[PDB]
Amino acid sequence: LTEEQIAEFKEAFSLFDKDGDGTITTKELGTVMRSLGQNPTEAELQDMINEVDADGNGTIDFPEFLTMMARKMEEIREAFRVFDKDGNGYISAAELRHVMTNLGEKLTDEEVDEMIREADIDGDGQVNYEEFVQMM
Amino acid sequence: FHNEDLKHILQLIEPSGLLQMKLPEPVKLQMCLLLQYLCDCQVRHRIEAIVAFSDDFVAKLQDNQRFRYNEVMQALNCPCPEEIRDQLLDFHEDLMTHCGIELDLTIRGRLLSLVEKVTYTLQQLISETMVRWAQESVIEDPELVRAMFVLLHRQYDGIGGLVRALPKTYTINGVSVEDTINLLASLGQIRSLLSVEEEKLMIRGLGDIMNNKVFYQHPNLMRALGMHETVMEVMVNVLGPKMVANCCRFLCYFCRISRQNQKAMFDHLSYLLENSSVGLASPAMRGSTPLDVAAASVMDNNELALALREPDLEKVVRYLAGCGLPVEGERYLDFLRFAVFCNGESVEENANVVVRLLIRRPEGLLAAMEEAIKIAEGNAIMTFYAALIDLLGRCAPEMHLIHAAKGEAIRIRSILRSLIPLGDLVGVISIAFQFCPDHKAAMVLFLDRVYVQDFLLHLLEVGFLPDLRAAASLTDMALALNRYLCTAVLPLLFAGTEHHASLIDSLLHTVKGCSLTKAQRDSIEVCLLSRPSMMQHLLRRLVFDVPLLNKMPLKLLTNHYERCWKYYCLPGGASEEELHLSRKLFWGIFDALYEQELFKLALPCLSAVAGALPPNF
Amino acid sequence: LFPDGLPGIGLSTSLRPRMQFSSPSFVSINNECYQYSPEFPLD
Amino acid sequence: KAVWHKLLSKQRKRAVVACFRMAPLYNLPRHRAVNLFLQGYEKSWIETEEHYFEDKLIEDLAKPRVDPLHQLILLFSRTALTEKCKLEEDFLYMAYADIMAKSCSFEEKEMEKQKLLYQQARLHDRGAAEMVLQTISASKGETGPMVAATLKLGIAILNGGNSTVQQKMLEYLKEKKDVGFFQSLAGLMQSCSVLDLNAFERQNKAEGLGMVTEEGSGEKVLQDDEFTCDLFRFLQLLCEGHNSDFQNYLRTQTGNNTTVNIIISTVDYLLRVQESISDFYWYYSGKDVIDEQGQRNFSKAIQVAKQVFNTLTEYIQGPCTGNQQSLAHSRLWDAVVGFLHVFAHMQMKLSQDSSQIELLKELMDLQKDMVVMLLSMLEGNVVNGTIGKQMVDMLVESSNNVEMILKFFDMFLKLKDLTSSDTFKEYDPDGKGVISKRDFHKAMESHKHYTQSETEFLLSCAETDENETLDYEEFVKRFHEPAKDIGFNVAVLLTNLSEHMPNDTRLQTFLELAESVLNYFQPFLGRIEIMGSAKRIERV
Amino acid sequence: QFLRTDDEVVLQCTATIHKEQQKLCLAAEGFGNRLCFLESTSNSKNVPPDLSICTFVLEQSLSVRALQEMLANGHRTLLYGHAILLRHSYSGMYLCCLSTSRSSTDKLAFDVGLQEDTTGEACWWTIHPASKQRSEGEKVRVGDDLILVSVSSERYLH
Ligand SMILES: [Ca+2]
Ligand SMILES: [Ca+2]
Ligand SMILES: [Ca+2]
Ligand SMILES: [Ca+2]
């Protein structure tokens, strides 16, 4: 398997990891599902462990995580299609409401231009294609 | 009576004979039980074909709907807005959502065809011959009359018998046909032993169930056979030695295997707590009490913990009213710890109820438990008064602001702080450096929950006095070392030289390993929250640590305490000579060719601390 | 499931716990009667 | 910038969560696919109409010695006659006394009453009024599923107020001098129910962290209210038609050693329901967004509170003087004190929604079914009778809450007069079904009747739909119809106190209080005079 | 017949000390002593009780819910399960549960004196019947023996 997406999955594992000892408990999963808007309880966290709990340690190990992503799930290529609704790389001031709708964070009303204006190259009033290769 | 014989036998009774004649009473009673057998195998045939259609149908269903859903989530993904949540459900709820709306896809014709067959002979004649008997022949013998109308009602409601058939059937493979049989051979031995050594055949019977590969794989099956109630009514029959325990150990394993099993075992808690016949300890009977079944019934699930109510906890403290002499009282408070906490954070409802019933009868404690600390020629009191404290630490209102921004969680916290003094430092610091490890951690988890940094220095000379200096003394001392790595974490939240004396003793103790790194995790943030003259003095031992660094115990102490010394070098914003060797001996490791990529970034803060602050023995 | 009924069918793919038997002999293996039942001629 | 890189992690932190969650799709075990398929097939697809088969079957057993049906009832009586200090399960009984109970426009309205009375003749000819009267007296106080099945038979026999069956229930009790029946009926209501809120907020917190709840409705309302409704309905059917030998049998119970005053014992029950819903008001009183479980715990509690008033009436309805006197000395008055106090405060907050009309109708109806009772308690008054004297005495002891409901009816009746005045109709429109809010704030104000406080309460929601106006027909149909039937009984009850009991002065406070009501219904109530069975004359 | 609001009442037990029926009543002084004590009545034919400092006037009776919302910022009839604000009839101060510790066996017996501060749940006493016959929610008649439970300390009037 291509180790680019596996290194991306290691980055995603460390994104999920908070105690940093190689094992992921249930509480990291509960906090990451509560931080992205959703409201889980202990029952959903518990049996969602028990499905993945083939290793039988109550935690998420790394290679079973890797094949669990390799089951269904590029990463930023599928993410760039969220940016590119229009297909020309432009993410306009009008198109920015169509990108940030399905995230979870309440977008601001003045700082949203400062996110563009610091990142924009010449000031075309949009977010172009060139703000993806050398911005991420 | 295989295929040739039943044609001889049915067409002896059918032709359409035996049934047409006139018969006396206690023979047609015998025929009625015979006639029930034919309908029973008719029911058996209906289930054997309803599992036959099922395997072919889900082979059409799963190979369609799992496969065609895979086409949608590659053509639409957007992790889970709407169309995921229709297929994001429980697997039980997914089954009802898939098929069970068809009484308002492409296979909607096929299952609708089957119910037409399972609409539905001899149903005509049994409904006829029960009428023909009961009309002309005015009946005594109510054992017969009860037997007649059952076969009438079972005939007219053949659906309702099948309604109580499907929550007993179960489907498995050809792999399981080995271990299932001698399971059933053992289970039938227990059902046969229900009516009566009598003990040893049950113990031989129960353990052979407990070593089966098909005993964990299908706990729905073991629930559907009702074999929790089987062993329980055996134990119900025994109660008013080892025959009680060896079935009781099976129940504790029975609830541990799944949550949905444990809900079914909840409904027997009323009888089960009425057994103070076992609480005189004598281990290893402490894995087999009827209390211990009551333990594992509530043990984890917070849903189960909220459902139980006040007469359950009334009887337990009624037994604690009996303890006015003892040793049995430690196990009741062991049970109530599983009634209030259950996850790591307490419940808010049962925690209120138990302490209100713990004031209506009360039973200095540290004035009394100190006097028995040298009692010899005993410990069952020393764990008891440790247990009652360990209970009361669990029913704390909140470490969250529910304690802060609310009344009615303080009213009860006022009770907890009033019944005890501070007091416990009898057991916390003083006696606990000699029994040792079980009770000092128990007194911590009370004091942390109920009751800033002035008592940080006041409650020093604690823990690492005997323990962190005796790393080669290893055996109860060795059993205490990994225990207080995690207990000493929550003390994250002048005498700092003595703290550095224990920390260097902790550094020698850090010279299990996941928890030893956990006590390092409470140590690495400890110097960050340090007047910094001790933090500058602790960095002098860090150069003493740097001499013994440039193994893995110092390698985690190299890159961490270097940036932490820069966090101690915020005070500059004397011993830089040893710091010059500290960059030199690190450069002496740099020319030698692990986690050394961490310590290499710690070298630039060693010049930035000199750019901010300085501008085996 | 259907004839185009007869409860004397021979398929019977349920579990159906098996028969075992023992012959009432007079060997000195006295912890082997001990299992099932005395045998009998069936058919 | 930094928030641009902050969404890249929260994209992958959230997209991995979907691969954690969507990985179960019935994939690898073919056993768990098929084992779960059956249980879902059961609870969805068996469950159909077989229920043509009852009325053919009891027809098939009432055929030409002794009938086949006649032995079946004879089995259950002789089973229920032996002392075992307990009943059984007897799943034969649980199905046959169900099937025996499942088998029960003027000319059709009499012919349906005709063929029903034939179908209860099919059963009570053969002692079916005795297995219901014995299986209650067998189980001493236990509310098991057995005794809940007999009440569904005894209701489906007495269903029309049957007179011969009500004669056979008594004349069986008189000769078999049965203590064990009235000992059993008092113990049956003794626990029986109450809506408890400590089980609700336990579940409400369990609605917090117990995410999906399948059948957690068990301890919620009254512990199987369907039995508790069916107890009192069986008691009401024992007295409809005014069996004055039986309403006096439920009181003093003459020819026995000990006596069970069952009529006080049902007063003590609904007082426990009065407090049970007052506490379900007080907890609720500040949230003001009734969720789904808040609705279906009132609706399962209103109907039982509705039912207990309907059987409270039938002990009083025929003017048995020893029965209404013996309930006036009891603690009835505290219940109707409390029930008023729920009526005002809820209606001011339940009539602020478009979703909370479904609770409003039921709570309006129980107000009517309350005053239908204390109309019927009043009917033996003479002029200044004591039972008329005490009924006004509770009317000042909760005087402060009679105000709001009488004020509530005026808001929706004075709207019902101002419907065809053209400063109500042709003011803002010609006529369309759209008026205004802003002119409705002043077209109503140019009728000069109401204070400004009542105009804003009338301006509660009134459309919540895109217009900042209201609707003509829908608002007035909710104004006229649900408060003119219930409001009529309150007008009758206020009439009935003054004309029967004059020469009170604080009653003249209440009369001139609701003068807008009594001058609206006075073209609808007739006051005739008869010679009502006491050889006196009473207004009707 | 029914105890109501604003009627002078007294509170007395009848405890026996070696078969001597001491019909002691609760009294207090104030104006220099913020504590309560006992007054004896059994030797009434020789020593009469100083009844100026024994009598208490009920001032209010609330449901518990009404109390909890009231702290959050005509003669009525007294009911069980209600919190009452007892008033000393002479000294004007209200009976309360002081948060101090004196004149006890020194385990958790809090002190009962009489203070001035009307607010706070220290001066509210709930009434619980010593009878399974008469129950919660109904009116308390003359001579009904009962329990007084504090709202703040939740300790009985021992
Ligand atoms: Ca982790
Ligand atoms: Ca793991
Ligand atoms: Ca554009
Ligand atoms: Ca650009």
From Swiss-Prot, chain A:
According to the UniProt entry, which residues carry N6-acetyllysine? K18, K85
How does the record describe the protein's post-translational processing?
Answer: Ubiquitination results in a strongly decreased activity. Phosphorylation results in a decreased activity.
Task: Name the segments for region: Necessary and sufficient for interaction with PCP4.
Answer: 73-136
Please name the CDD domains in this protein's record: EFh (cd00051)
Q: What is the effect of changing F80L?
A: In LQT14; significantly decreased of KCNN2 calcium-activated potassium channel activity; not changed KCNN2 expression; not changed KCNN2 location at membrane; decreased thermal stability in presence of calcium ions; decreased interaction with RYR2
Q: Name one Pfam family in it.
A: EF-hand_7
GO CC terms: calcium channel complex; calyx of Held; catalytic complex; centrosome; cytoplasm; cytosol; extracellular region; myelin sheath
Answer whether the UniProt record assigns the keyword Repeat to this protein.
yes
* Sites of the Glycyl lysine isopeptide (Lys-Gly) (interchain with G-Cter in ubiquitin) crosslink: K18
Write out the residues that bind Ca(2+) 4: D120, D122, D124, Q126, E131
The organism's superkingdom is given as Eukaryota
Quote the record's activity regulation.
(Microbial infection) Inactivated by S.flexneri OspC1 and OspC3 proteins, which specifically bind the apo-form of calmodulin, thereby preventing calcium-binding and activity.
Q: What does this protein do?
A: Calmodulin acts as part of a calcium signal transduction pathway by mediating the control of a large number of enzymes, ion channels, aquaporins and other proteins through calcium-binding. Calcium-binding is required for the activation of calmodulin. Among the enzymes to be stimulated by the calmodulin-calcium complex are a number of protein kinases, such as myosin light-chain kinases and calmodulin-dependent protein kinase type II (CaMK2), and phosphatases. (Microbial infection) Required for Legionella pneumophila SidJ glutamylase activity.
UniProt miscellaneous comment: This protein has four functional calcium-binding sites.
Give the protein name, as stated in the record.
Calmodulin-1
Please give the organism: Homo sapiens
Task: Supply the source organism's classification.
Answer: Eukaryota, Metazoa, Chordata, Craniata, Vertebrata
Q: Which gene encodes it?
A: CALM1
